[PDB]
Design an enzyme around this catalytic site. Structure first.
Site, PDB file in Angstrom:
ATOM      1  N   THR A 196      12.784   4.827  -7.520  1.00 25.30           N
ATOM      2  CA  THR A 196      12.902   5.481  -8.837  1.00 25.30           C
ATOM      3  C   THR A 196      11.802   6.539  -9.032  1.00 25.30           C
ATOM      4  O   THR A 196      10.604   6.250  -8.932  1.00 25.30           O
ATOM      5  CB  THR A 196      12.827   4.432  -9.929  1.00 25.30           C
ATOM      6  OG1 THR A 196      13.801   3.392  -9.685  1.00 25.30           O
ATOM      7  CG2 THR A 196      13.047   5.073 -11.279  1.00 25.30           C
ATOM      8  N   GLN A 197      12.206   7.774  -9.269  1.00 24.39           N
ATOM      9  CA  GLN A 197      11.278   8.859  -9.572  1.00 24.39           C
ATOM     10  C   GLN A 197      11.319   9.180 -11.071  1.00 24.39           C
ATOM     11  O   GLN A 197      10.324   9.565 -11.665  1.00 24.39           O
ATOM     12  CB  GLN A 197      11.701  10.081  -8.785  1.00 24.39           C
ATOM     13  CG  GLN A 197      11.301  10.019  -7.329  1.00 24.39           C
ATOM     14  CD  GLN A 197       9.805  10.188  -7.149  1.00 24.39           C
ATOM     15  OE1 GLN A 197       9.102  10.707  -8.008  1.00 24.39           O
ATOM     16  NE2 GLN A 197       9.317   9.793  -5.995  1.00 24.39           N
TER      17      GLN A 197
END
Lengths: 48, 238, 234, 216, 202, 243, 231
Positions: D1-2
C-alpha cells in the site's frame, strides 16, 4: 466360490459351537471367501 | 534384486528395500542412549576411533540452547540435517523471538527426510538421530529414522548392539521419572555399557555425555569433564 | 546391471563412496605427523620416468599460510577441493578478520562430501564422489593440528596418519614410533624412514616432498638442499 | 500500500493487574468521510492475545487473515504450545519491516495486547517496523491526546485495577471524540484477563457541551 | 456512477445509473453496471471501467469453477471474498469499487462492499460511486429496518434519482434488479418512471 | 513377478493393471487397523495403536491428525507418507480458507487430496503413497461426513469404514450397528468395542486405543475423546469382550 | 511431480538404421489408405473413412482437414498424432501469416511440419509420430502435393498413395494416371485407386475427398462425393 461360501460359513457354523448357522457365519465367510480370491490373476479366456 | 536399487520401487510384499537398507546404516554407527527424568534430558554416547592414534568421532551435536542431538550413521547426512535444524532454530528465534519447540523441529525433520523417499534417484538420509530437548512441555527425547518416521521416546538407544541398552532401559523406566541428574547420567552410562564386550569398558576417551534441563542449557561433556560421572559407577564384573 | 549413484547396499553403504575409498588405495602414500613443535607432511612423488620434471609434481599444497594439505588418489579431483578450501579460508578472513581454524576448513571441504546425484539437481553438480584422501596440517589457537579426510566426508583429527597404497604398513610403523612428545626433527626423520621402507624406488631429494608448519613459521615446503641435509642422516 | 484508502484512526491500550484493555472506534473513514460507521478494528488472536489497528483497513484485514491462519495451523498440532503475545508481536514486527524494506508497506499502526504466564503485554508495531513495549499505548492522535493522560496516571499509580483502566480508557476515548475530527462516538473495548479475551459491544461516550454557552 | 444495494428479508435490491464518462463526454449513456457473477449473485461496478470489467470476468471464472466443483449454489460471501482478494492484491494498479449482492440458501439476502482499497465489509445497505457522496443524507434518513421488497425498490429508485440529479458523472437511466430465491427480476426506470423532485423556483 | 511390469507406476501390466499401486495397497494391508463411523450427529474415529516397545511414550506416533479445525484424519500404513499427506491436507484447507473465505467442504478437500495422491500413480519419477486415510467432519450446513482415500487416489464416502489388517472383520462388526440413528456418544463405546474385538492379542502384543470426536457435541471442532469417555468406552469394551 | 525423460528413444542400430522410425512407418503402413493426385489445374486427396459400426456419426470427425484457405491435409496412420500435427500446422501457418501478411506457401508449411516431425526423433523421452501426411496446396498458379513421413523427410509427388496396399495403389497410379488431367478426372482416378482396396460398398460416408484448385482448398460434401461415386 459361492459353494465354498456356504462351506466356509459352515466351518464357522461347526466353529466355536452353533449347530444352527445364521447371518453371522455368512458374511465373515463371504468376504473371507472373496478375500483369498485375490490370489487368482486372469480367470477369463475367450476363444478366437 | 530388481526391487533393491530404487526408493521409488515398492516390493511385491509391501516394503521399500532402499529405505530398509538405509535403516541398516543406523546400526553401523556406535551406540548411543537417551533418557529423561521429569526435568532433564540426557544423551550418552559411545564415541569410537579408527586407529589408536586417531581421535574419537564426536557423536553429540549442539543445535540450539535447548536442543542437542546424538547421531548414528553417515556423518555427512548427519551434518546436513544438523545444519538444517540449526537454521530452523535460528529462523524461529529470528521471526518469533521464542525457542523452537522440539516436537516442531522434529516434524520439520520428518517432512524434510520424507521427500527423498519418493523421488527417483534420490536416496534416503543415511542417519538416525536422538534429540534431547527442553521446552514449555518439559524434557523430550525423540528418535528419527531414515524412513522419515519419528517417535516420542521415554528413553531410547540406537546403533550397533543397542538392543542390550534397549533391554536395560526397558527394565529401569520406572526409576527414571524421579531420578536426579547424577543418577540419570549413571543409568545412561550403564545402558551404554551393556553395549560392550566384557573385555572393553567406558573411559574418558570414548564417552560423551549431553545434558539439557529446566535450569541448564544443553551442554556437552567429554575428556575430563566426564570423569566426575564415571568415577561413581559400580565396576560391573562379568 | 545399472543402479543409481545414490543407491544403498543392503549392508548399509553407498557403493559410490566405497568404490571411491577403493580408488584411494592406488594413490601415492602420504604421512602426516602432529607434534607440539609443529606438523609435518611427507609424500612420495612416484615419478614414472627420468624425463618427467618432478618439480611439476605437487601432492603437497598451501591452503593458507598456516594450513597445508597432502593429497592421495585422483589428483585432478583434489584440485577442486583445494581450490574450494583456499577460497573458504579467504572468505572467512574477509568476513571476520581472523584466520580459519584447521577444523573449520576441514569441515568446509568435508561439506562437499556427498554432494553428488543425478536427477533433481543443478546441471553443473557432481556426478560422483571425490576419489581422493586429504591430510590437512595446520597451526591455530589450539596449537598444531592434523586432520584426515576421506570421500565419505568423515574428517577426523589424527596424531599421526598415513594415506595411500602403503597405508596399512606405514600406519603400523607410525604406531610403533609415535608419542605425544616427539620433536619435529624426530617426526620428519621417522616419516622419511617409513617412507623409505614403503617406497618402490630409492628414496632421494627429487623423489619425495616434505613440508612443515610450526607455530612461529608459515607453511614451509622443503627445498632440495634442505631435503638432502635430512636424507644424509639416514 | 502506497496510498491508504479506508482508514481507522486511534487505538488505545493500557495494562492493569492481571490483564490488558484496548479500545477503538468502529469507523472506517474514506478521507474525511465517515463511510463505514460499523466495522471492528479489533481482532481476537487466540485466547491470550488481541490486536487493534490504525491505518488502512484492507491491510488490517490481510493481517487478520494471516494471523488467523497461523493460529489455526498451530492449534492443529496440539503439542501444548501456543503463540505468546510477544511472539505475535515479533512476527508482526518482522512482517511490517519486510514489506517496508520492499517499499510496499502495510499502512498500519498496531497495538497488541495480551496476558500469558501471569504477565501483561502491550506492544506497538509501526509500518516501518518500529516496535516497543509500554504500559500504555496510543496510536495516531491518541499518541498526542490520550497518551499524556495515560502516562500522567501511570506515573502516579503504576498498577491499575481493571475498573480504573476501563474508566481511564473511557475518558481518553472521550477526549479523542472531542479533539480528533476523524473519530466516532461508538467504540469497542477488548479485554484480556486469565478468563480470556472479551470484546464488549458498541459503546458510546457521554459528552459535555456546556462551553457552547460561553461565547459572549 | 451511482450504485446501490439494499437488503430485505427474502433477498436484495440493486440499482445503478447508466452513465459512463470519459471526461465530461458521455461515452455510454446507457451502460449496464449490474453484472451477474452467478445465477443469483450480482456485482455493481464503479471506478475504472476496464478494471471492473476485467475483475468481474475473473471472478465469474473462478466462482463458476468452484460452484461446479462443489455442486452447490455458491455463497455470496465467497464471490465477495474472491473480488476482495483480487482488488486487494492489485490495489496499486486497479481502481475498482465493487458491491457484491445476492441471495444464498445458507444466509439469505446479503450485500458486501469491496471499496477501492480491497477491504470487505457486509452492509445492510451499500452505496458507491461518485454520486454516492450526495445521497448519504437521504439514504440515512430514509432507511428503516424491515422494509418490504417494493419499499426497497422505491427506496433505491428515489436515491438513485437524487444522485443522478446532483452528480454530473451520473445520469441516464436507472437499472434495478431484485434478487431472491424466486430468481432475478430486472427492471429499467427511464424518463417519467424516474422519481422527480420539485425544484425550488423563486 | 520378476517380469518388469511391476517396477514403475508408469507401466501397465498386459492385463491392464498398475502393480506398484497394488503393492502400495499391500503396504497398507500390513498396517494396524483403524476404523471410523458416521452417525447422525458427527463422526467417530478409532485407532488400534500397537505398542512396539514400552520405551515409547503414551501418545507417540499418533495416527489421528487435525487437518483442519473442522476436519480430522485417521491413517493407516507407512506413517511417513501419512504425515506428508496430513501436511498436504492441511495446506489445501489453509489455501482454501485464504482464497474463498470459508472452511473447506469435506467432499472438496477429499477430492483435492485424492487428486494429489492420484498424481503419484502416473509417473516413474515418484512412488505411490503407502497409506490409506479417513477424513471426518461435521457441519450444520452439510451434516456429518466421512471419506476414505486409498493409494490409487480413490475417494469414497462411508457410513462406516475400516483400514489395515482387520479391514473386513471390522466391517462385519460395523454392519451390526444402527449408526444412522445412534449418537456419537453411544458410538464411542461401540468403536472401542469393535477395536477390542478386531484386535489379535496373539500376533500383536499390547496396544493403546486412540479415539476422536467430531460433531454437534464439539460444535464442529475435531477433538480428542476425553480420558474419561475413553476409559468408559474401554471398560465397556473389555467387559463386552467376555462373551 | 514430473520432469521429462531427457534421452533419445530413437537411436542408431549397428547397421545404421533408426529402428523406431521404421517401426513408426510400420504403423503408417497399417492405417486406412489415402491417395493424392496433382492434376494440372488442381489437387485431389481422398481417404477411406470406414468406421466399425452404424453407431459412429460420420459427420463428427473428418480426416481431410484444412490447414488454411489454400492448403489441405490427409493422413495415414495413427489418428491422435494426426490431430496434433494438424493443430501444429495451423499454428505454423498463422505464425507465417502474422509475419508476412501473405498466406504460407505449401512448400514452406511442408518444411515446417516436417521439422516438427523430426524433433520427435531427437528430443527426449518421446516416440516419433506414426503418421504420414499428404499436403495439398495452391500457390503461385501451380498446384502442390507433398508427403511427409515420421522421419521428418518430405517429397513432392505428382501422385501417390499411403497406408495399406500403398504399393499396388502406387503402381495403379503410375499406369492409369498421367498429366493434362483436369481436377474432375483426377477425382475420378482417385476414387478409382481408392476402390482398389475399399473392401465393401463404397458409400458417400465411407470415404472423404478434398480438392484444392485456384479457388481455395475445400472438402467435398457427401452429396458431391455421391455424385462422383456414381461412377
Amino acid at each position: 466360490d459361492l459353494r465354498n461360501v456356504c462351506t466356509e460359513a459352515g466351518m464357522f457354523a461347526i466353529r466355536a459351537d452353533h449347530d444352527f448357522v445364521v447371518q453371522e457365519d455368512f458374511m465373515k465367510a463371504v468376504r473371507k471367501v472373496a478375500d483369498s480370491k485375490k490370489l487368482e490373476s486372469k480367470l477369463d479366456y475367450k476363444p478366437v | 534384486n530388481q526391487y533393491d536399487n530404487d526408493v521409488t520401487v515398492w516390493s511385491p510384499q509391501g516394503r521399500i528395500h532402499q529405505i530398509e537398507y538405509a535403516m541398516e546404516a543406523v546400526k553401523q554407527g556406535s551406540a548411543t542412549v537417551g533418557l529423561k527424568s521429569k526435568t532433564h534430558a540426557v544423551l550418552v554416547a559411545l564415541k569410537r576411533a579408527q586407529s589408536e592414534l586417531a581421535a574419537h568421532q564426536k557423536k553429540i551435536l549442539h543445535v540450539d540452547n535447548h536442543i542437542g542431538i546424538s547421531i548414528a550413521g553417515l556423518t555427512a547426512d548427519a551434518r546436513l540435517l544438523c545444519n538444517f535444524m540449526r537454521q530452523e532454530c535460528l529462523d524461529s528465534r529470528f521471526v518469533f523471538d521464542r525457542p523452537l519447540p522440539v516436537s516442531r523441529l522434529v516434524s520439520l525433520i520428518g517432512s524434510k527426510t520424507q521427500i527423498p523417499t519418493q523421488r527417483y534417484g534420490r536416496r534416503p538420509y543415511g542417519v538416525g538421530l536422538l534429540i534431547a530437548g527442553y521446552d514449555d512441555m518439559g524434557p523430550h527425547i525423540f528418535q528419527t529414522c531414515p524412513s522419515a518416521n519419528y517417535f516420542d521416546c521415554r528413553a531410547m538407544s540406537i546403533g550397533a548392539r543397542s538392543q542390550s541398552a534397549r533391554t536395560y532401559l526397558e527394565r529401569h523406566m520406572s526409576e527414571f521419572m524421579e531420578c536426579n541428574l547424577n543418577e540419570l547420567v549413571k543409568h545412561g552410562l550403564r545402558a551404554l555399557r551393556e553395549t560392550l564386550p566384557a573385555e572393553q569398558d567406558l573411559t574418558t576417551k570414548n564417552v560423551s555425555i549431553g545434558i539439557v534441563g529446566k535450569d541448564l542449557e544443553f551442554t556437552i561433556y567429554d575428556d575430563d569433564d566426564v570423569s566426575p560421572f564415571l568415577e561413581g559407577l559400580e565396576e560391573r564384573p562379568q | 546391471y545399472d543402479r543409481g549413484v545414490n543407491t544403498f547396499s543392503p549392508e548399509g553403504r553407498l557403493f559410490q563412496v566405497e568404490y571411491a575409498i577403493e580408488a584411494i588405495k592406488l594413490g601415492s602414500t602420504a604421512i602426516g605427523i602432529q607434534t607440539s613443535e609443529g606438523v609435518c607432511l611427507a609424500v612420495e612423488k612416484r615419478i614414472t620416468s627420468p624425463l618427467m620434471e618432478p618439480s611439476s609434481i605437487e601432492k603437497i599444497v598451501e591452503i593458507d599460510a598456516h594450513i597445508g594439505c597432502a593429497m592421495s588418489g585422483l589428483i585432478a579431483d583434489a584440485k577442486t577441493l583445494i581450490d574450494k578450501a583456499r577460497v573458504e579460508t579467504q572468505n572467512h578472513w574477509f568476513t571476520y578478520n581472523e584466520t580459519m581454524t584447521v577444523e573449520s576448513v576441514t569441515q568446509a571441504v568435508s561439506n562437499l562430501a556427498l554432494q553428488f546425484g543425478e536427477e533433481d539437481a543443478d546441471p553443473g553438480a557432481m556426478s560422483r564422489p571425490f576419489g581422493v584422501a586429504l591430510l590437512f596440517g595446520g597451526v591455530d589457537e589450539k596449537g598444531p593440528q592434523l586432520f584426515h579426510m576421506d570421500p565419505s566426508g568423515t574428517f577426523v583429527q589424527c596424531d599421526a596418519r598415513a594415506i595411500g597404497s602403503a597405508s596399512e604398513g606405514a600406519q603400523s610403523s607410525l604406531q610403533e614410533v609415535y608419542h605425544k612428545s616427539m620433536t619435529l626433527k624426530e617426526a620428519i626423520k621417522s616419516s622419511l624412514i617409513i617412507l623409505k621402507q614403503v617406497m618402490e624406488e630409492k628414496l632421494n631429494a627429487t623423489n619425495i616432498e616434505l613440508a612443515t608448519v610450526q607455530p612461529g613459521q608459515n607453511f614451509h615446503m622443503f627445498t632440495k638442499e634442505e631435503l638432502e641435509e635430512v636424507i644424509k642422516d639416514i | 500500500t502506497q496510498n491508504p484508502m479506508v482508514t481507522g484512526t486511534s487505538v488505545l491500550g493500557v495494562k492493569f493487574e492481571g490483564g490488558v484493555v484496548i479500545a477503538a472506534d468502529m469507523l472506517g473513514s474514506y478521507g474525511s468521510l465517515a463511510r463505514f460507521r460499523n466495522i471492528s478494528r479489533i481482532m481476537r488472536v487466540n485466547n491470550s492475545t488481541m490486536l487493534g489497528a490504525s491505518g488502512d483497513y484492507a491491510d488490517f484485514q490481510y493481517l487478520k487473515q494471516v494471523l488467523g491462519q497461523m493460529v489455526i495451523d498451530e492449534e492443529l498440532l496440539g503439542d501444548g504450545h501456543s503463540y505468546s503475545p510477544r511472539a505475535i508481536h515479533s512476527w508482526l514486527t518482522r512482517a511490517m519491516y519486510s514489506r517496508r524494506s520492499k517499499m510496499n508497506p502495510l499502512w498500519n499502526t498496531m497495538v497488541i495486547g495480551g496476558y500469558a504466564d501471569g504477565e501483561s503485554f502491550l506492544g506497538y508495531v509501526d509500518m516501518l517496523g518500529v516496535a516497543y513495549e509500554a504500559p500504555s499505548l496510543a496510536t495516531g492522535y491518541g499518541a498526542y491526546l490520550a497518551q499524556p493522560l495515560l502516562r500522567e496516571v501511570l506515573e502516579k499509580q503504576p498498577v491499575l485495577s481493571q475498573t480504573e483502566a476501563r474508566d481511564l480508557v473511557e475518558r481518553c476515548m472521550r477526549v479523542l471524540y472531542y479533539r480528533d475530527a476523524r473519530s466516532y462516538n461508538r467504540f469497542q473495548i477488548a479485554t484480556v484477563t486469565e478468563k480470556g479475551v472479551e470484546i464488549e459491544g458498541p459503546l458510546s461516550t457521554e459528552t459535555n457541551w456546556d462551553i457552547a454557552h460561553m461565547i459572549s | 456512477t451511482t450504485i446501490m444495494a439494499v437488503q430485505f428479508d427474502g433477498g436484495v435490491v440493486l440499482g445503478a445509473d447508466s452513465r459512463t464518462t470519459t471526461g465530461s463526454y458521455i461515452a455510454n449513456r446507457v451502460t449496464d453496471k449490474l453484472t451477474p457473477i452467478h445465477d443469483r449473485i450480482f456485482c455493481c461496478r464503479s471506478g475504472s471501467a476496464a478494471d471492473t470489467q476485467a475483475v468481474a470476468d475473473a471472478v465469474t471464472y473462478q466462482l463458476g469453477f468452484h460452484s461446479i466443483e462443489l455442486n452447490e449454489p455458491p455463497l455470496v460471501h465467497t464471490a465477495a471474498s474472491l473480488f476482495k482478494e483480487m482488488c486487494y492484491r492489485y490495489r496499486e494498479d486497479l481502481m475498482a469499487g465493487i458491491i457484491i449482492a445476492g441471495w444464498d440458501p445458507q444466509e439469505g439476502g446479503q450485500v458486501y462492499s469491496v471499496p477501492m482499497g480491497g477491504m470487505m465489509v457486509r452492509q445492510s445497505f451499500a452505496i458507491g460511486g461518485s454520486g454516492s457522496s450526495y445521497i448519504y443524507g437521504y439514504v440515512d434518513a430514509t432507511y428503516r429496518e424491515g422494509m418490504t421488497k417494493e419499499e426497497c425498490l422505491q427506496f433505491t429508485a428515489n436515491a438513485l434519482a437524487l444522485a443522478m440529479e446532483r452528480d454530473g458523472s451520473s445520469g441516464g437511466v436507472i437499472r434495478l434488479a431484485a434478487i431472491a430465491e424466486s430468481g432475478v427480476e430486472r427492471q429499467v426506470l427511464l424518463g417519467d418512471q424516474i422519481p422527480k423532485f420539485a425544484v425550488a423556483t423563486l | 513377478i520378476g517380469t518388469g511390469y511391476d517396477l514403475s507406476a508408469s507401466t501397465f501390466s498386459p492385463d491392464g493393471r498398475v502393480f506398484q499401486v497394488e503393492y502400495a495397497m499391500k503396504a497398507v494391508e500390513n498396517s494396524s487397523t483403524a476404523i471410523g463411523i458416521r452417525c447422525k450427529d458427527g463422526v467417530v474415529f478409532g485407532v488400534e495403536k500397537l505398542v512396539l516397545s514400552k520405551l515409547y511414550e503414551e501418545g507417540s506416533n499418533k495416527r489421528l491428525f487435525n487437518v483442519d479445525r473442522h476436519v480430522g484424519m485417521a491413517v493407516a500404513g507407512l506413517l511417513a507418507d501419512a504425515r506428508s499427506l496430513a501436511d498436504i491436507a492441511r495446506e489445501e484447507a489453509s489455501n482454501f480458507r485464504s482464497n474463498f473465505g470459508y472452511n473447506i467442504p469435506l467432499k472438496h478437500l477429499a477430492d483435492r487430496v485424492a487428486m494429489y495422491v492420484h498424481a503419484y500413480t502416473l509417473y516413474s519419477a515418484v512412488r505411490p503413497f503407502g497409506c490409506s486415510f479417513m477424513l471426518g467432519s461435521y457441519s450444520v450446513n452439510d451434516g456429518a461426513q466421512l471419506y476414505m482415500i486409498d493409494p490409487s487416489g480413490v475417494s469414497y464416502g462411508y457410513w462406516g469404514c475400516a483400514i489395515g489388517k482387520a479391514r473386513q472383520a471390522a466391517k462385519t462388526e460395523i454392519e451390526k450397528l444402527q449408526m444412522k440413528e445412534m449418537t456419537c456418544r453411544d458410538i464411542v463405546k461401540e468403536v472401542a468395542k469393535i477395536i477390542y474385538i478386531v484386535h489379535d492379542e496373539v500376533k500383536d502384543k499390547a496396544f493403546e486405543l486412540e479415539l476422536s470426536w467430531v460433531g454437534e457435541l464439539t460444535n464442529g471442532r475435531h477433538e480428542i475423546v476425553p480420558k474419561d469417555i475413553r476409559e468408559e468406552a474401554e471398560k465397556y469394551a473389555k467387559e463386552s469382550l467376555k462373551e | 511431480a514430473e520432469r521429462g525423460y531427457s534421452f533419445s528413444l530413437t537411436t542408431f542400430s549397428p547397421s545404421g538404421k533408426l529402428v523406431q522410425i521404421e517401426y513408426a512407418l510400420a504403423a503408417v503402413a497399417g492405417g486406412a489408405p489415402s491417395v493424392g493426385i496433382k492434376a494440372a489445374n488442381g489437387v485431389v486427396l481422398a481417404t477411406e473413412k470406414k468406421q466399425k459400426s452404424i453407431l459412429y456419426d460420420e459427420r463428427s470427425v473428418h480426416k481431410v482437414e484444412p490447414i488454411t484457405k489454400h492448403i489441405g491435409l490427409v493422413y495415414s496412420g495413427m489418428g491422435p498424432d494426426y490431430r496434433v500435427l494438424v493443430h501444429r500446422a495451423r499454428k505454423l501457418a498463422q505464425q507465417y501469416y502474422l509475419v508476412y501478411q501473405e498466406p504460407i506457401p505449401t512448400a514452406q508449411l511442408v518444411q515446417r511440419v516436417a521439422s516438427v516431425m523430426q524433433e520427435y526423433t531427437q528430443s527426449g523421452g518421446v516416440r516419433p509420430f506414426g503418421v504420414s501426411l499428404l499436403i495439398c496446396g495452391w500457390n503461385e498458379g501451380r498446384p502442390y502435393l507433398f508427403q511427409s513421413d515420421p522421419s521428418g523427410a518430405y517429397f513432392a509427388w505428382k501422385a501417390t498413395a499411403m497406408g495399406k496396399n500403398y504399393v499396388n495403389g502406387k503402381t495403379f497410379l503410375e499406369k492409369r494416371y498421367n498429366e493434362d488431367l483436369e481436377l474432375e478426372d483426377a477425382i475420378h482416378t482417385a476414387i478409382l485407386t481408392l476402390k482398389e482396396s475399399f473392401e465393401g460398398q463404397m458409400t458417400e460416408d465411407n470415404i472423404e475427398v478434398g480438392i484444392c484448385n485456384e479457388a481455395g482448398f475445400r472438402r467435398l460434401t457427401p452429396t458431391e462425393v455421391k455424385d462422383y461415386l456414381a461412377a
